[PDB]
Amino acid sequence: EEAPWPPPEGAFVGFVLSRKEPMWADLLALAAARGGRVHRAPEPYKALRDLKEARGLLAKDLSVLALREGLGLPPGDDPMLLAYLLDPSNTTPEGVARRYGGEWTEEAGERAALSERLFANLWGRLEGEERLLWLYREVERPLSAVLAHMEATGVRLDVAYLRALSLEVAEEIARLEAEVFRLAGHPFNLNSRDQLERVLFDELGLPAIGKTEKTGKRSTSAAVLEALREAHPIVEKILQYRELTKLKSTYIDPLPDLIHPRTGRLHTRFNQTATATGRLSSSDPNLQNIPVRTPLGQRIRRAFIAEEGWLLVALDYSQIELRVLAHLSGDENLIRVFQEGRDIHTETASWMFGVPREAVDPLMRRAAKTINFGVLYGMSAHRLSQELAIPYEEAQAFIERYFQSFPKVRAWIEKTLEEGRRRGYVETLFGRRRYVPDLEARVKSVREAAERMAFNMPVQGTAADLMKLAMVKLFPRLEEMGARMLLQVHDELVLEAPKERAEAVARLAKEVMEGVYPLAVPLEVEVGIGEDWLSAKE
DNA sequence: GACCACGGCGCA
DNA sequence: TGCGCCGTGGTC
Ligand SMILES: Nc1ncnc2c1ncn2[C@H]1CC[C@@H](COP(=O)(O)OP(=O)(O)OP(=O)(O)O)O1
Ligand SMILES: [Mg+2]
Ligand code: NA
Ligand code: NA
Ligand code: NA
Ligand code: NA
């Protein structure tokens, strides 16, 4: 059972970290298991040099830490990836363990033994599941290596810039805070939604609109505040206060404190088994939700910069989820729009909601986007009218004139739900699965909620599969050009390239992304270059 | 000190 | 539709 370090090749690794973040963790223990024997490493760090590959639960995490120490240790087989492909609700080692025959403990040796056992059991369950096997070998397993390099590389942050911006925003916050209190006739904690509720609906005469989900309090959400924007001067200042405090507390203040001492850069984690649809997630810190939609947000984007002598290259799949819907549904009108190379939102703004596409004003185009997104998420005419500043009836029509112009989308949604009810799951173009039991619920509200989750997954998940595949293909090509892949934001990639190669890099990555997997419609990629994330965007 | 539920909101 | 993080108001 107990055998001296080192282990034979192909052994499963087990390791304990002082904390969950690979880039910040002390490696406390390092074990390995193979053929019914466990090898525990006398000194974890030195023991790392003996390994040729990290095979086991949470492989990437160990690879990231290895890369941190200047070791080129790649992640290989990971039972978590197998489990997640079988059922995307398999997101943690704790859960996967109890489910497939072990216990996730806090000891390296037991973790190595667990990894071996779980892999054997899980690999057998993936026999016959050829499409999931293809996903594992061709996408998830290789992807884990790409992600490990991204995590270890990190991205550069203009700290002094954010420090200065912080002091600016702090001053503006105090003005709004002072005004709000003037209008309230007294100070209170403006960050407390409970105290705000009292002030708005009880102390001021403002009418409550909706209520909160769990506790049933009168909501003070943006949707509610926006509707009361001209019911009282205090509202506008509260909306602005919300924006500034959100951005300051979430990005401006925390980010500078997260710079790594060795790298001088910011290192997120790209979670590979975290979502029900097949998307990645980002945490510690989350870099897939850096602001950009507001002025202040854009000034925050500017903080993410290229290394000196380098440029950022930002690549973005144009309307990918819509293109994927065109393919999956086979709707002629939708397919023709993309094949003719037309702006789908502009076309959507003419095909319905009047005419003609020579064209529509910009405010009309966002109207079309709202509809499209709405269809994507199964948004009711209610929330659509509230999202469109138009009477409820005006929204109902807009939704109908949509399914008139793109009939096969309707047929596709109905077909997807029917098959989901029979099989108990839905799938992406590549066969990635999400089980959706509640399609058979006897409570309409629950059932319908489940339906929206169900038919959306094939779209969101196919777009995720495509991006993942693209990253897998793109990565080796960048390596050979001396370029870096830094971040992924669902439909977008951010790279780093030497100034002199930035053009060549952008051209190559663009073409690699557009040709990732030919569909019934072309994939168009928009690319931008700049010294910071904002100026690199379009 | 850590952790929780909630409402709220940042991004795709 | 899918995430992860914030402060509040709390518990332990
Ligand atoms: N405000 C919002 N609300 C909900 N979902 C949103 C969103 N913004 C984006 N998404 C979702 C849906 C799409 C995706 C981001 O795509 P783009 O925002 O770039 O819209 P695209 O289709 O490319 O039209 P373009 O104007 O760019 O031509 O994330
Ligand atoms: Mg876009
Ligand atoms: Na991992
Ligand atoms: Na139904
Ligand atoms: Na989606
Ligand atoms: Na090569």
Side-chain angles (χ1 to χ4, degrees), chain A residues 1-354 356-538:
Chain A
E1 187 73 274
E2 261 288 84
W5 192 267
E9 76 166 355
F12 292 86
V13 65
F15 62 93
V16 182
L17 307 177
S18 66
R19 49 187 300 178
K20 64 184 179 187
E21 309 92 334
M23 282 298 304
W24 297 95
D26 187 13
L27 180 56
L28 301 176
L30 215 212
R34 172 144 222 72
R37 69 181 53 172
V38 48
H39 307 83
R40 292 183 171 91
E43 203 294 296
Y45 284 98
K46 181 180 181 180
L48 227 49
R49 275 79 181 177
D50 300 323
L51 308 183
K52 193 52 174 290
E53 181 184 61
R55 292 170 86 260
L57 291 163
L58 303 179
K60 162 167 68 58
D61 281 1
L62 180 56
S63 172
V64 174
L65 181 148
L67 286 173
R68 182 191 77 202
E69 301 299 317
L71 307 180
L73 183 64
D77 287 326
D78 180 345
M80 290 301 300
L81 299 183
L82 296 175
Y84 179 72
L85 282 172
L86 287 163
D87 185 347
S89 64
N90 289 138
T91 64
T92 74
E94 290 92 332
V96 164
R98 269 190 305 273
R99 189 168 175 181
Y100 303 98
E103 184 182 350
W104 179 252
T105 63
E106 292 289 311
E107 200 274 312
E110 298 174 346
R111 290 180 170 183
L114 179 63
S115 301
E116 184 181 26
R117 293 142 50 98
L118 293 189
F119 184 88
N121 197 9
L122 279 158
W123 180 254
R125 292 170 178 251
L126 270 189
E127 186 255 323
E129 305 291 9
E130 268 294 350
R131 308 188 77 197
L132 295 172
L133 264 171
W134 181 94
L135 282 165
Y136 179 76
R137 299 199 223 90
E138 307 291 342
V139 176
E140 302 295 355
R141 186 169 60 187
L143 180 63
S144 70
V146 177
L147 296 176
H149 282 287
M150 294 166 65
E151 290 184 31
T153 303
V155 59
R156 190 167 176 235
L157 190 68
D158 196 340
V159 168
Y161 173 79
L162 286 184
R163 292 301 186 194
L165 181 69
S166 181
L167 297 177
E168 182 158 2
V169 175
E171 280 174 19
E172 178 63 14
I173 288 178
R175 298 173 178 108
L176 295 168
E177 186 172 337
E179 287 187 353
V180 174
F181 298 159
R182 175 187 63 258
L183 296 166
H186 69 100
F188 66 95
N189 187 356
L190 195 46
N191 294 335
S192 168
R193 54 87 50 227
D194 279 349
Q195 294 178 221
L196 182 57
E197 172 183 1
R198 247 97 62 178
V199 171
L200 290 176
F201 314 123
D202 288 340
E203 298 179 9
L204 299 177
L206 308 194
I209 299 179
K211 294 208 170 187
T212 63
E213 180 65 28
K214 302 293 179 176
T215 62
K217 297 177 184 178
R218 291 165 302 192
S219 173
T220 68
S221 67
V224 168
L225 296 169
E226 283 173 350
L228 268 41
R229 179 186 285 101
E230 283 178 328
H232 200 283
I234 200 180
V235 176
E236 195 77 70
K237 306 305 176 184
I238 290 165
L239 286 169
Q240 299 172 22
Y241 177 90
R242 283 268 177 90
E243 177 180 3
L244 267 62
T245 54
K246 175 70 161 188
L247 302 193
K248 186 174 187 298
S249 71
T250 300
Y251 312 94
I252 304 181
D253 283 342
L255 293 173
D257 291 342
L258 296 173
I259 294 299
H260 199 276
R262 300 176 184 182
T263 68
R265 291 158 75 110
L266 208 54
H267 296 84
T268 181
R269 303 181 65 197
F270 288 105
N271 309 115
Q272 202 172 354
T273 70
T275 77
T277 58
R279 273 188 178 185
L280 299 173
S281 85
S282 170
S283 60
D284 306 296
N286 188 354
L287 299 184
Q288 288 176 330
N289 73 335
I290 306 302
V292 69
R293 298 172 188 176
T294 63
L296 213 223
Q298 299 173 184
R299 296 167 74 194
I300 297 170
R301 274 291 165 115
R302 284 191 185 115
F304 292 78
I305 55 174
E307 195 180 51
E308 297 301 354
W310 294 58
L311 290 173
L312 295 183
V313 176
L315 300 115
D316 181 300
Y317 277 109
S318 306
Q319 311 107 18
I320 190 169
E321 293 174 348
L322 292 183
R323 291 171 193 268
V324 159
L325 176 59
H327 181 82
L328 293 186
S329 67
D331 182 81
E332 268 64 50
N333 281 342
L334 213 52
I335 286 174
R336 191 172 78 265
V337 172
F338 292 120
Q339 272 189 181
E340 289 180 344
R342 307 195 182 281
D343 177 349
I344 182 186
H345 299 304
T346 296
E347 300 301 323
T348 294
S350 69
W351 245 274
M352 83 187 62
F353 159 45
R357 64 92 193 287
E358 315 288 13
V360 316
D361 63 24
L363 223 65
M364 286 175 59
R365 201 187 89 106
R366 160 51 79 172
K369 285 186 62 174
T370 305
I371 301 296
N372 289 331
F373 297 167
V375 179
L376 231 68
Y377 309 144
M379 197 164 307
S380 68
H382 329 198
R383 187 173 175 179
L384 180 58
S385 75
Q386 192 165 18
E387 290 277 346
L388 227 47
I390 61 178
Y392 174 80
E393 352 290 289
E394 294 196 15
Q396 284 189 295
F398 278 3
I399 293 184
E400 279 306 341
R401 193 178 293 103
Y402 179 89
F403 292 120
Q404 303 289 10
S405 295
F406 315 105
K408 287 197 175 178
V409 167
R410 257 268 197 72
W412 180 85
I413 291 172
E414 302 304 343
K415 173 201 278 57
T416 307
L417 296 175
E418 155 61 25
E419 189 176 36
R421 285 186 291 262
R422 190 193 67 245
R423 304 186 310 183
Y425 66 90
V426 288
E427 64 193 3
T428 60
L429 182 65
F430 300 114
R432 185 187 300 274
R433 289 168 194 167
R434 181 187 179 172
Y435 290 82
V436 191
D438 288 343
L439 291 177
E440 303 270 29
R442 314 300 270 189
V443 178
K444 184 161 66 176
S445 73
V446 169
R447 182 175 66 253
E448 283 181 352
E451 292 177 339
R452 286 181 300 259
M453 301 181 321
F455 73 75
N456 169 90
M457 181 267 170
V459 171
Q460 178 174 321
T462 297
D465 292 342
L466 290 167
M467 172 59 81
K468 287 186 170 178
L469 186 52
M471 298 171 71
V472 168
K473 294 180 171 298
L474 182 55
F475 183 73
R477 310 297 307 276
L478 295 179
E479 212 122 42
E480 68 202 29
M481 303 186 76
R484 300 163 181 157
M485 187 174 295
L486 302 183
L487 309 169
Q488 180 263 46
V489 198
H490 315 302
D491 63 354
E492 175 185 359
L493 283 182
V494 177
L495 313 180
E496 209 178 28
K499 287 182 183 292
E500 72 277 10
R501 297 191 187 93
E503 275 297 341
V505 170
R507 275 192 279 266
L508 177 132
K510 178 179 180 299
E511 183 178 7
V512 162
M513 297 173 68
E514 296 184 342
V516 61
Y517 191 89
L519 306 176
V521 302
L523 302 177
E524 308 289 9
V525 173
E526 140 195 330
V527 65
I529 304 175
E531 307 206 346
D532 73 64
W533 201 351
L534 184 65
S535 64
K537 204 77 79 309
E538 304 288 42

PDB file of all heavy atoms in Angstrom, chain A residues 90-109:
ATOM      1  N   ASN A  90     -22.489  17.947 -11.940  1.00  0.00           N
ATOM      2  CA  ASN A  90     -21.272  17.503 -11.268  1.00  0.00           C
ATOM      3  C   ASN A  90     -20.225  18.620 -11.305  1.00  0.00           C
ATOM      4  O   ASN A  90     -19.469  18.737 -12.268  1.00  0.00           O
ATOM      5  CB  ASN A  90     -20.713  16.239 -11.925  1.00  0.00           C
ATOM      6  CG  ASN A  90     -21.566  15.008 -11.662  1.00  0.00           C
ATOM      7  OD1 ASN A  90     -21.794  14.196 -12.560  1.00  0.00           O
ATOM      8  ND2 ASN A  90     -22.039  14.860 -10.427  1.00  0.00           N
ATOM      9  N   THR A  91     -20.187  19.439 -10.257  1.00  0.00           N
ATOM     10  CA  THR A  91     -19.336  20.628 -10.245  1.00  0.00           C
ATOM     11  C   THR A  91     -18.244  20.617  -9.171  1.00  0.00           C
ATOM     12  O   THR A  91     -17.296  21.397  -9.248  1.00  0.00           O
ATOM     13  CB  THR A  91     -20.168  21.927 -10.082  1.00  0.00           C
ATOM     14  OG1 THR A  91     -20.821  21.923  -8.810  1.00  0.00           O
ATOM     15  CG2 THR A  91     -21.216  22.053 -11.185  1.00  0.00           C
ATOM     16  N   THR A  92     -18.368  19.742  -8.175  1.00  0.00           N
ATOM     17  CA  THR A  92     -17.402  19.710  -7.076  1.00  0.00           C
ATOM     18  C   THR A  92     -16.868  18.302  -6.810  1.00  0.00           C
ATOM     19  O   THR A  92     -17.546  17.316  -7.085  1.00  0.00           O
ATOM     20  CB  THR A  92     -18.006  20.277  -5.769  1.00  0.00           C
ATOM     21  OG1 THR A  92     -18.927  19.334  -5.208  1.00  0.00           O
ATOM     22  CG2 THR A  92     -18.727  21.598  -6.035  1.00  0.00           C
ATOM     23  N   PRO A  93     -15.640  18.208  -6.277  1.00  0.00           N
ATOM     24  CA  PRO A  93     -15.051  16.912  -5.926  1.00  0.00           C
ATOM     25  C   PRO A  93     -15.864  16.241  -4.824  1.00  0.00           C
ATOM     26  O   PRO A  93     -16.024  15.019  -4.834  1.00  0.00           O
ATOM     27  CB  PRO A  93     -13.659  17.285  -5.398  1.00  0.00           C
ATOM     28  CG  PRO A  93     -13.398  18.659  -5.917  1.00  0.00           C
ATOM     29  CD  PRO A  93     -14.730  19.327  -5.982  1.00  0.00           C
ATOM     30  N   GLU A  94     -16.364  17.040  -3.884  1.00  0.00           N
ATOM     31  CA  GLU A  94     -17.250  16.544  -2.837  1.00  0.00           C
ATOM     32  C   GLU A  94     -18.409  15.759  -3.437  1.00  0.00           C
ATOM     33  O   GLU A  94     -18.654  14.610  -3.063  1.00  0.00           O
ATOM     34  CB  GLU A  94     -17.807  17.698  -1.997  1.00  0.00           C
ATOM     35  CG  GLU A  94     -16.790  18.394  -1.104  1.00  0.00           C
ATOM     36  CD  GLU A  94     -16.136  19.590  -1.770  1.00  0.00           C
ATOM     37  OE1 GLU A  94     -16.023  19.596  -3.014  1.00  0.00           O
ATOM     38  OE2 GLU A  94     -15.731  20.528  -1.048  1.00  0.00           O
ATOM     39  N   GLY A  95     -19.129  16.387  -4.365  1.00  0.00           N
ATOM     40  CA  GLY A  95     -20.300  15.766  -4.963  1.00  0.00           C
ATOM     41  C   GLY A  95     -19.944  14.561  -5.813  1.00  0.00           C
ATOM     42  O   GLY A  95     -20.541  13.486  -5.682  1.00  0.00           O
ATOM     43  N   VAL A  96     -18.957  14.740  -6.685  1.00  0.00           N
ATOM     44  CA  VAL A  96     -18.527  13.676  -7.578  1.00  0.00           C
ATOM     45  C   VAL A  96     -18.080  12.445  -6.797  1.00  0.00           C
ATOM     46  O   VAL A  96     -18.356  11.315  -7.197  1.00  0.00           O
ATOM     47  CB  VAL A  96     -17.395  14.165  -8.516  1.00  0.00           C
ATOM     48  CG1 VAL A  96     -16.669  12.988  -9.161  1.00  0.00           C
ATOM     49  CG2 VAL A  96     -17.967  15.103  -9.573  1.00  0.00           C
ATOM     50  N   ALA A  97     -17.395  12.669  -5.678  1.00  0.00           N
ATOM     51  CA  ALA A  97     -16.925  11.571  -4.837  1.00  0.00           C
ATOM     52  C   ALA A  97     -18.080  10.726  -4.298  1.00  0.00           C
ATOM     53  O   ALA A  97     -18.159   9.531  -4.579  1.00  0.00           O
ATOM     54  CB  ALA A  97     -16.072  12.099  -3.693  1.00  0.00           C
ATOM     55  N   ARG A  98     -18.969  11.342  -3.524  1.00  0.00           N
ATOM     56  CA  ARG A  98     -20.099  10.608  -2.962  1.00  0.00           C
ATOM     57  C   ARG A  98     -20.877   9.880  -4.051  1.00  0.00           C
ATOM     58  O   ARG A  98     -21.382   8.777  -3.840  1.00  0.00           O
ATOM     59  CB  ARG A  98     -21.036  11.538  -2.186  1.00  0.00           C
ATOM     60  CG  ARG A  98     -20.707  11.652  -0.703  1.00  0.00           C
ATOM     61  CD  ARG A  98     -21.804  12.391   0.054  1.00  0.00           C
ATOM     62  NE  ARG A  98     -22.078  13.704  -0.528  1.00  0.00           N
ATOM     63  CZ  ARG A  98     -21.416  14.815  -0.217  1.00  0.00           C
ATOM     64  NH1 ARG A  98     -20.436  14.779   0.677  1.00  0.00           N
ATOM     65  NH2 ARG A  98     -21.733  15.964  -0.801  1.00  0.00           N
ATOM     66  N   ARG A  99     -20.961  10.500  -5.222  1.00  0.00           N
ATOM     67  CA  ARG A  99     -21.771   9.958  -6.301  1.00  0.00           C
ATOM     68  C   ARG A  99     -21.126   8.763  -7.009  1.00  0.00           C
ATOM     69  O   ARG A  99     -21.825   7.847  -7.433  1.00  0.00           O
ATOM     70  CB  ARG A  99     -22.118  11.051  -7.309  1.00  0.00           C
ATOM     71  CG  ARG A  99     -23.126  10.616  -8.341  1.00  0.00           C
ATOM     72  CD  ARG A  99     -23.659  11.797  -9.134  1.00  0.00           C
ATOM     73  NE  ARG A  99     -24.541  11.355 -10.210  1.00  0.00           N
ATOM     74  CZ  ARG A  99     -25.142  12.168 -11.071  1.00  0.00           C
ATOM     75  NH1 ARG A  99     -24.962  13.479 -10.990  1.00  0.00           N
ATOM     76  NH2 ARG A  99     -25.927  11.664 -12.016  1.00  0.00           N
ATOM     77  N   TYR A 100     -19.802   8.758  -7.127  1.00  0.00           N
ATOM     78  CA  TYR A 100     -19.144   7.717  -7.920  1.00  0.00           C
ATOM     79  C   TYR A 100     -18.178   6.808  -7.153  1.00  0.00           C
ATOM     80  O   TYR A 100     -17.387   6.084  -7.757  1.00  0.00           O
ATOM     81  CB  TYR A 100     -18.484   8.320  -9.169  1.00  0.00           C
ATOM     82  CG  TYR A 100     -19.467   9.076 -10.041  1.00  0.00           C
ATOM     83  CD1 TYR A 100     -19.581  10.458  -9.952  1.00  0.00           C
ATOM     84  CD2 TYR A 100     -20.297   8.406 -10.932  1.00  0.00           C
ATOM     85  CE1 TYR A 100     -20.482  11.157 -10.733  1.00  0.00           C
ATOM     86  CE2 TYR A 100     -21.201   9.097 -11.722  1.00  0.00           C
ATOM     87  CZ  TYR A 100     -21.288  10.475 -11.616  1.00  0.00           C
ATOM     88  OH  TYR A 100     -22.182  11.180 -12.390  1.00  0.00           O
ATOM     89  N   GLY A 101     -18.246   6.839  -5.825  1.00  0.00           N
ATOM     90  CA  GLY A 101     -17.615   5.798  -5.031  1.00  0.00           C
ATOM     91  C   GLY A 101     -16.373   6.156  -4.242  1.00  0.00           C
ATOM     92  O   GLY A 101     -15.382   5.424  -4.268  1.00  0.00           O
ATOM     93  N   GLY A 102     -16.426   7.267  -3.521  1.00  0.00           N
ATOM     94  CA  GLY A 102     -15.333   7.645  -2.648  1.00  0.00           C
ATOM     95  C   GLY A 102     -15.716   8.784  -1.728  1.00  0.00           C
ATOM     96  O   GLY A 102     -16.885   9.151  -1.618  1.00  0.00           O
ATOM     97  N   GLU A 103     -14.720   9.350  -1.065  1.00  0.00           N
ATOM     98  CA  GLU A 103     -14.948  10.467  -0.167  1.00  0.00           C
ATOM     99  C   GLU A 103     -13.839  11.492  -0.347  1.00  0.00           C
ATOM    100  O   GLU A 103     -12.653  11.161  -0.266  1.00  0.00           O
ATOM    101  CB  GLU A 103     -14.999   9.985   1.284  1.00  0.00           C
ATOM    102  CG  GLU A 103     -15.329  11.074   2.288  1.00  0.00           C
ATOM    103  CD  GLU A 103     -15.328  10.568   3.721  1.00  0.00           C
ATOM    104  OE1 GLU A 103     -15.260   9.335   3.925  1.00  0.00           O
ATOM    105  OE2 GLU A 103     -15.391  11.408   4.646  1.00  0.00           O
ATOM    106  N   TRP A 104     -14.226  12.735  -0.608  1.00  0.00           N
ATOM    107  CA  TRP A 104     -13.257  13.813  -0.743  1.00  0.00           C
ATOM    108  C   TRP A 104     -12.785  14.246   0.634  1.00  0.00           C
ATOM    109  O   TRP A 104     -13.535  14.864   1.395  1.00  0.00           O
ATOM    110  CB  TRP A 104     -13.871  14.996  -1.491  1.00  0.00           C
ATOM    111  CG  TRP A 104     -12.944  16.165  -1.667  1.00  0.00           C
ATOM    112  CD1 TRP A 104     -13.013  17.370  -1.027  1.00  0.00           C
ATOM    113  CD2 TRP A 104     -11.816  16.245  -2.550  1.00  0.00           C
ATOM    114  NE1 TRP A 104     -12.001  18.195  -1.459  1.00  0.00           N
ATOM    115  CE2 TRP A 104     -11.253  17.529  -2.392  1.00  0.00           C
ATOM    116  CE3 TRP A 104     -11.228  15.356  -3.457  1.00  0.00           C
ATOM    117  CZ2 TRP A 104     -10.128  17.941  -3.107  1.00  0.00           C
ATOM    118  CZ3 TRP A 104     -10.113  15.767  -4.162  1.00  0.00           C
ATOM    119  CH2 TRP A 104      -9.574  17.048  -3.984  1.00  0.00           C
ATOM    120  N   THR A 105     -11.537  13.910   0.951  1.00  0.00           N
ATOM    121  CA  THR A 105     -10.962  14.212   2.256  1.00  0.00           C
ATOM    122  C   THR A 105      -9.923  15.317   2.141  1.00  0.00           C
ATOM    123  O   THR A 105      -9.789  15.951   1.095  1.00  0.00           O
ATOM    124  CB  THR A 105     -10.286  12.975   2.867  1.00  0.00           C
ATOM    125  OG1 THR A 105      -9.194  12.569   2.034  1.00  0.00           O
ATOM    126  CG2 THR A 105     -11.280  11.825   2.984  1.00  0.00           C
ATOM    127  N   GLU A 106      -9.182  15.535   3.221  1.00  0.00           N
ATOM    128  CA  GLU A 106      -8.186  16.598   3.265  1.00  0.00           C
ATOM    129  C   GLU A 106      -6.768  16.041   3.297  1.00  0.00           C
ATOM    130  O   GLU A 106      -5.841  16.711   3.744  1.00  0.00           O
ATOM    131  CB  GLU A 106      -8.424  17.498   4.478  1.00  0.00           C
ATOM    132  CG  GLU A 106      -9.696  18.317   4.397  1.00  0.00           C
ATOM    133  CD  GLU A 106      -9.600  19.424   3.366  1.00  0.00           C
ATOM    134  OE1 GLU A 106      -8.595  20.170   3.390  1.00  0.00           O
ATOM    135  OE2 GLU A 106     -10.530  19.549   2.540  1.00  0.00           O
ATOM    136  N   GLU A 107      -6.602  14.810   2.826  1.00  0.00           N
ATOM    137  CA  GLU A 107      -5.284  14.185   2.811  1.00  0.00           C
ATOM    138  C   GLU A 107      -4.861  13.872   1.382  1.00  0.00           C
ATOM    139  O   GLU A 107      -5.654  13.365   0.588  1.00  0.00           O
ATOM    140  CB  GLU A 107      -5.273  12.919   3.675  1.00  0.00           C
ATOM    141  CG  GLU A 107      -3.879  12.475   4.114  1.00  0.00           C
ATOM    142  CD  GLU A 107      -3.186  11.606   3.084  1.00  0.00           C
ATOM    143  OE1 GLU A 107      -3.825  10.656   2.589  1.00  0.00           O
ATOM    144  OE2 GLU A 107      -2.000  11.865   2.778  1.00  0.00           O
ATOM    145  N   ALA A 108      -3.608  14.179   1.063  1.00  0.00           N
ATOM    146  CA  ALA A 108      -3.097  14.037  -0.295  1.00  0.00           C
ATOM    147  C   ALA A 108      -3.165  12.599  -0.801  1.00  0.00           C
ATOM    148  O   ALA A 108      -3.627  12.351  -1.914  1.00  0.00           O
ATOM    149  CB  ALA A 108      -1.677  14.568  -0.383  1.00  0.00           C
ATOM    150  N   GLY A 109      -2.702  11.659   0.019  1.00  0.00           N
ATOM    151  CA  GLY A 109      -2.693  10.254  -0.352  1.00  0.00           C
ATOM    152  C   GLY A 109      -4.074   9.730  -0.700  1.00  0.00           C
ATOM    153  O   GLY A 109      -4.261   9.062  -1.719  1.00  0.00           O
TER     154      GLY A 109
END
